[PDB]
Amino acid sequence: TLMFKRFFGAVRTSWRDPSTRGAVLSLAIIVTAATIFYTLAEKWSVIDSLFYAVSVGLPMGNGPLSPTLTLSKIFTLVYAILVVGLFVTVGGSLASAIVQNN
Amino acid sequence: TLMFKRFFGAVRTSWRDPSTRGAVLSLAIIVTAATIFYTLAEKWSVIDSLFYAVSVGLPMGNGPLSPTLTLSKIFTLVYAILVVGLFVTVGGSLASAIVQNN
Amino acid sequence: TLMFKRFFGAVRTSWRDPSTRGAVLSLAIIVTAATIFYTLAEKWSVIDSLFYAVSVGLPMGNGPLSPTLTLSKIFTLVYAILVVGLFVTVGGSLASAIVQNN
Amino acid sequence: TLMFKRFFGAVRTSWRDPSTRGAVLSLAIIVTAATIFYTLAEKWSVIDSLFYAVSVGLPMGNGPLSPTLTLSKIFTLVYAILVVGLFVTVGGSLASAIVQNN
Ligand SMILES: [Ca+2]
Ligand SMILES: [Ca+2]
Ligand SMILES: [Ca+2]
């Protein structure tokens, strides 16, 4: 029953596009890229890898998960600084869409 | 003894509405669902669930609690992206309403 | 060595005033109240109470600290929704004020 | 393995400048001083210190690292309010500069 969320959520209001919710596109590369890195370098599972990635722009909250290696530390910074912007506007957009969707 | 805040804040500032504080309603809907899932899925108590729900889109931080199921992990992930926007705007309007009460 | 931050920072650009930074007043009262609550309920030392209270407006991160009692859990959500906006507007004001000093 | 992000990230969007990204300069100062503090006060390594400093101004999330002494606790609070702004606009300018680069 996580249906009503995924379907009346990420799927449904993710298809409200201006020229400037090409930020979603921008987001997806970056999150995905981070996830790959986390999986490979930090050795974590895909979900956990994704969880960490999502965490560094959003108030969600990383898990037990934190970087243990120098590359993972440094990388987390550089990614984090960028994506924080990206997460924001997208969240705003979706929020906006939700309200005029009822 | 939080009787001060609940009357002076939480049930103070909501009694003030524009068009865009339709956002409250959506946020309410999001949170409730989230909490329910947590209680059912993640087995935690109503508040612990409820706390966790709030934790994900505001910066406060979750202490001990973190999702342990892949299913709940994705639920957070999906749910995270929707609610944050809502949190932002309710956060802002609500804050402004304090300021216009002094 | 914090003196350089404290004087060159949260007072040096704190005293940059319009009418609309009356939120600083509000921030002070609200942060104070929460701190008091934390001190009382959570048993915590005043600094720690203060630490936690600020942790929840800002992207900070609490320490190892988090609400362990039900009232504290309940209180935190309520407070966080209120105070976040305050933290935001003040932050922007203060931010803008560093930049205006170059 | 992060060479994509380092060169095509927070060195690419740097060579894209108006004058109100003097905020990057501000952030560098505040961040650097913070790092200096944390290394010294809290005994941590430089990388860890940097991470922690970043962690208080972004949704990133402090790992194990958090302050343990009053001096550092207070300092975080002070710094936290200051940096929160500078981070935010940095993310924003940076963020837009990604979409303007596509
Ligand atoms: Ca986070
Ligand atoms: Ca926080
Ligand atoms: Ca955290």
mmCIF file of all heavy atoms in Angstrom, chain A residues 99, chain B residues 13-26 89-90 92-98 100:
data_model
loop_
_atom_site.group_PDB
_atom_site.id
_atom_site.type_symbol
_atom_site.label_atom_id
_atom_site.label_comp_id
_atom_site.label_asym_id
_atom_site.label_seq_id
_atom_site.Cartn_x
_atom_site.Cartn_y
_atom_site.Cartn_z
ATOM 1 N N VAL A 99 -0.475 20.991 -4.533
ATOM 2 C CA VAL A 99 -1.512 21.845 -3.997
ATOM 3 C C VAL A 99 -2.606 22.068 -5.016
ATOM 4 O O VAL A 99 -3.785 22.082 -4.663
ATOM 5 C CB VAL A 99 -1.001 23.183 -3.370
ATOM 6 C CG1 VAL A 99 -0.596 22.979 -1.924
ATOM 7 C CG2 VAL A 99 0.158 23.780 -4.146
ATOM 8 N N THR B 13 -1.155 30.143 15.265
ATOM 9 C CA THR B 13 -0.700 30.677 13.946
ATOM 10 C C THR B 13 -1.401 30.082 12.697
ATOM 11 O O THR B 13 -1.406 30.655 11.588
ATOM 12 C CB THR B 13 0.831 30.472 13.830
ATOM 13 O OG1 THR B 13 1.411 30.521 15.149
ATOM 14 C CG2 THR B 13 1.455 31.489 12.922
ATOM 15 N N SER B 14 -1.981 28.909 12.897
ATOM 16 C CA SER B 14 -2.818 28.265 11.898
ATOM 17 C C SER B 14 -4.150 28.979 11.678
ATOM 18 O O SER B 14 -4.694 28.910 10.577
ATOM 19 C CB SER B 14 -3.085 26.829 12.303
ATOM 20 O OG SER B 14 -1.871 26.224 12.665
ATOM 21 N N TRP B 15 -4.652 29.672 12.704
ATOM 22 C CA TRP B 15 -5.929 30.413 12.620
ATOM 23 C C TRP B 15 -5.782 31.747 11.820
ATOM 24 O O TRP B 15 -6.293 32.807 12.213
ATOM 25 C CB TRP B 15 -6.547 30.586 14.032
ATOM 26 C CG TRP B 15 -7.010 29.273 14.710
ATOM 27 C CD1 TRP B 15 -6.538 28.009 14.463
ATOM 28 C CD2 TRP B 15 -8.008 29.127 15.759
ATOM 29 N NE1 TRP B 15 -7.188 27.089 15.270
ATOM 30 C CE2 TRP B 15 -8.087 27.742 16.073
ATOM 31 C CE3 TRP B 15 -8.850 30.026 16.448
ATOM 32 C CZ2 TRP B 15 -8.976 27.233 17.052
ATOM 33 C CZ3 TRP B 15 -9.737 29.514 17.427
ATOM 34 C CH2 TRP B 15 -9.788 28.132 17.711
ATOM 35 N N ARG B 16 -5.112 31.620 10.669
ATOM 36 C CA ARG B 16 -4.608 32.671 9.787
ATOM 37 C C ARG B 16 -4.332 31.872 8.509
ATOM 38 O O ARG B 16 -3.468 30.971 8.541
ATOM 39 C CB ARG B 16 -3.296 33.220 10.362
ATOM 40 C CG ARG B 16 -3.332 34.656 10.838
ATOM 41 C CD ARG B 16 -2.503 35.532 9.904
ATOM 42 N NE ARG B 16 -2.818 35.297 8.490
ATOM 43 C CZ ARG B 16 -2.047 35.620 7.453
ATOM 44 N NH1 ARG B 16 -0.875 36.212 7.629
ATOM 45 N NH2 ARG B 16 -2.449 35.334 6.223
ATOM 46 N N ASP B 17 -5.098 32.164 7.436
ATOM 47 C CA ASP B 17 -5.087 31.454 6.115
ATOM 48 C C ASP B 17 -5.214 32.381 4.839
ATOM 49 O O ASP B 17 -6.088 33.256 4.803
ATOM 50 C CB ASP B 17 -6.220 30.398 6.043
ATOM 51 C CG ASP B 17 -6.075 29.265 7.062
ATOM 52 O OD1 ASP B 17 -5.793 29.533 8.252
ATOM 53 O OD2 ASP B 17 -6.290 28.099 6.672
ATOM 54 N N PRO B 18 -4.346 32.185 3.798
ATOM 55 C CA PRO B 18 -4.457 32.703 2.429
ATOM 56 C C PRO B 18 -4.877 31.558 1.531
ATOM 57 O O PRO B 18 -5.164 30.472 2.016
ATOM 58 C CB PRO B 18 -2.998 32.944 2.057
ATOM 59 C CG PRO B 18 -2.335 31.741 2.654
ATOM 60 C CD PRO B 18 -3.024 31.559 3.980
ATOM 61 N N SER B 19 -4.830 31.790 0.229
ATOM 62 C CA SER B 19 -4.883 30.718 -0.745
ATOM 63 C C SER B 19 -3.853 29.594 -0.523
ATOM 64 O O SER B 19 -4.225 28.421 -0.601
ATOM 65 C CB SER B 19 -4.740 31.273 -2.154
ATOM 66 O OG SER B 19 -3.518 31.974 -2.267
ATOM 67 N N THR B 20 -2.580 29.943 -0.262
ATOM 68 C CA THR B 20 -1.447 28.954 -0.282
ATOM 69 C C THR B 20 -1.324 28.035 0.949
ATOM 70 O O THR B 20 -0.720 26.956 0.879
ATOM 71 C CB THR B 20 -0.057 29.582 -0.575
ATOM 72 O OG1 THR B 20 0.336 30.439 0.505
ATOM 73 C CG2 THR B 20 -0.038 30.329 -1.922
ATOM 74 N N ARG B 21 -1.896 28.462 2.070
ATOM 75 C CA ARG B 21 -2.080 27.565 3.210
ATOM 76 C C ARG B 21 -3.222 26.543 2.999
ATOM 77 O O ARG B 21 -3.848 26.058 3.939
ATOM 78 C CB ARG B 21 -2.205 28.343 4.522
ATOM 79 C CG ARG B 21 -0.945 29.144 4.895
ATOM 80 C CD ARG B 21 -1.168 29.896 6.194
ATOM 81 N NE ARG B 21 -0.354 31.107 6.288
ATOM 82 C CZ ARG B 21 -0.469 32.032 7.234
ATOM 83 N NH1 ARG B 21 -1.353 31.911 8.207
ATOM 84 N NH2 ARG B 21 0.301 33.105 7.192
ATOM 85 N N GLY B 22 -3.487 26.237 1.736
ATOM 86 C CA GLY B 22 -4.015 24.932 1.359
ATOM 87 C C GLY B 22 -2.902 23.906 1.548
ATOM 88 O O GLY B 22 -3.163 22.685 1.645
ATOM 89 N N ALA B 23 -1.658 24.408 1.614
ATOM 90 C CA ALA B 23 -0.437 23.614 1.807
ATOM 91 C C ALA B 23 -0.419 22.831 3.090
ATOM 92 O O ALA B 23 0.220 21.824 3.182
ATOM 93 C CB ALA B 23 0.806 24.504 1.720
ATOM 94 N N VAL B 24 -1.092 23.375 4.114
ATOM 95 C CA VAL B 24 -1.245 22.735 5.418
ATOM 96 C C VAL B 24 -1.919 21.358 5.202
ATOM 97 O O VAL B 24 -1.441 20.340 5.772
ATOM 98 C CB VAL B 24 -2.002 23.624 6.383
ATOM 99 C CG1 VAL B 24 -2.105 22.992 7.757
ATOM 100 C CG2 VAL B 24 -1.241 24.936 6.478
ATOM 101 N N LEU B 25 -2.997 21.385 4.430
ATOM 102 C CA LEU B 25 -3.851 20.232 4.253
ATOM 103 C C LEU B 25 -3.057 19.065 3.650
ATOM 104 O O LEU B 25 -3.096 17.899 4.133
ATOM 105 C CB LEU B 25 -5.026 20.578 3.307
ATOM 106 C CG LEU B 25 -6.235 21.412 3.730
ATOM 107 C CD1 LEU B 25 -6.799 20.801 4.997
ATOM 108 C CD2 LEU B 25 -5.952 22.911 3.903
ATOM 109 N N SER B 26 -2.345 19.424 2.605
ATOM 110 C CA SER B 26 -1.523 18.451 1.842
ATOM 111 C C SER B 26 -0.460 17.881 2.755
ATOM 112 O O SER B 26 -0.239 16.652 2.772
ATOM 113 C CB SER B 26 -0.935 19.127 0.623
ATOM 114 O OG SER B 26 -1.676 20.292 0.313
ATOM 115 N N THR B 89 7.035 25.558 2.970
ATOM 116 C CA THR B 89 6.064 26.684 2.754
ATOM 117 C C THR B 89 5.211 26.883 3.955
ATOM 118 O O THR B 89 4.968 28.033 4.322
ATOM 119 C CB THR B 89 5.251 26.677 1.455
ATOM 120 O OG1 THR B 89 4.264 25.648 1.520
ATOM 121 C CG2 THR B 89 6.166 26.495 0.239
ATOM 122 N N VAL B 90 4.783 25.744 4.571
ATOM 123 C CA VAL B 90 4.071 25.849 5.884
ATOM 124 C C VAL B 90 4.993 26.494 6.911
ATOM 125 O O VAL B 90 4.518 27.294 7.690
ATOM 126 C CB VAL B 90 3.397 24.530 6.309
ATOM 127 C CG1 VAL B 90 2.527 24.791 7.518
ATOM 128 C CG2 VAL B 90 2.476 23.983 5.202
ATOM 129 N N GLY B 92 7.391 28.616 6.427
ATOM 130 C CA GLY B 92 7.531 30.041 6.096
ATOM 131 C C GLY B 92 6.320 30.859 6.440
ATOM 132 O O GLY B 92 6.488 31.866 7.148
ATOM 133 N N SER B 93 5.140 30.443 5.961
ATOM 134 C CA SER B 93 3.896 31.144 6.231
ATOM 135 C C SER B 93 3.662 31.258 7.755
ATOM 136 O O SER B 93 3.316 32.334 8.271
ATOM 137 C CB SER B 93 2.759 30.321 5.623
ATOM 138 O OG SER B 93 2.758 30.310 4.207
ATOM 139 N N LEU B 94 3.868 30.104 8.408
ATOM 140 C CA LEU B 94 3.661 30.008 9.846
ATOM 141 C C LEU B 94 4.588 31.005 10.581
ATOM 142 O O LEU B 94 4.128 31.577 11.549
ATOM 143 C CB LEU B 94 3.772 28.556 10.316
ATOM 144 C CG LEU B 94 2.657 28.043 11.248
ATOM 145 C CD1 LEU B 94 1.196 28.361 10.892
ATOM 146 C CD2 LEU B 94 2.814 26.539 11.305
ATOM 147 N N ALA B 95 5.844 31.030 10.131
ATOM 148 C CA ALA B 95 6.826 31.915 10.739
ATOM 149 C C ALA B 95 6.451 33.366 10.559
ATOM 150 O O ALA B 95 6.518 34.144 11.530
ATOM 151 C CB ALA B 95 8.264 31.631 10.329
ATOM 152 N N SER B 96 6.002 33.686 9.349
ATOM 153 C CA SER B 96 5.578 35.053 9.015
ATOM 154 C C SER B 96 4.437 35.482 9.900
ATOM 155 O O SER B 96 4.412 36.622 10.286
ATOM 156 C CB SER B 96 5.284 35.214 7.516
ATOM 157 O OG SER B 96 4.564 36.387 7.181
ATOM 158 N N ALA B 97 3.478 34.548 10.165
ATOM 159 C CA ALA B 97 2.356 34.808 11.016
ATOM 160 C C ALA B 97 2.721 35.073 12.474
ATOM 161 O O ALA B 97 1.878 35.682 13.156
ATOM 162 C CB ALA B 97 1.327 33.714 10.847
ATOM 163 N N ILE B 98 3.853 34.561 12.935
ATOM 164 C CA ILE B 98 4.368 34.914 14.251
ATOM 165 C C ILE B 98 4.746 36.408 14.259
ATOM 166 O O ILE B 98 4.400 37.182 15.159
ATOM 167 C CB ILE B 98 5.640 34.119 14.715
ATOM 168 C CG1 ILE B 98 5.484 32.619 14.492
ATOM 169 C CG2 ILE B 98 6.054 34.458 16.164
ATOM 170 C CD1 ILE B 98 6.670 31.794 14.941
ATOM 171 N N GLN B 100 3.954 38.829 12.253
ATOM 172 C CA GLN B 100 2.783 39.691 12.185
ATOM 173 C C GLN B 100 1.874 39.584 13.429
ATOM 174 O O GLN B 100 0.716 40.006 13.399
ATOM 175 C CB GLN B 100 1.985 39.357 10.935
ATOM 176 C CG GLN B 100 2.721 39.530 9.630
ATOM 177 C CD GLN B 100 1.863 39.128 8.449
ATOM 178 O OE1 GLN B 100 0.740 38.627 8.612
ATOM 179 N NE2 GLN B 100 2.387 39.324 7.244
#
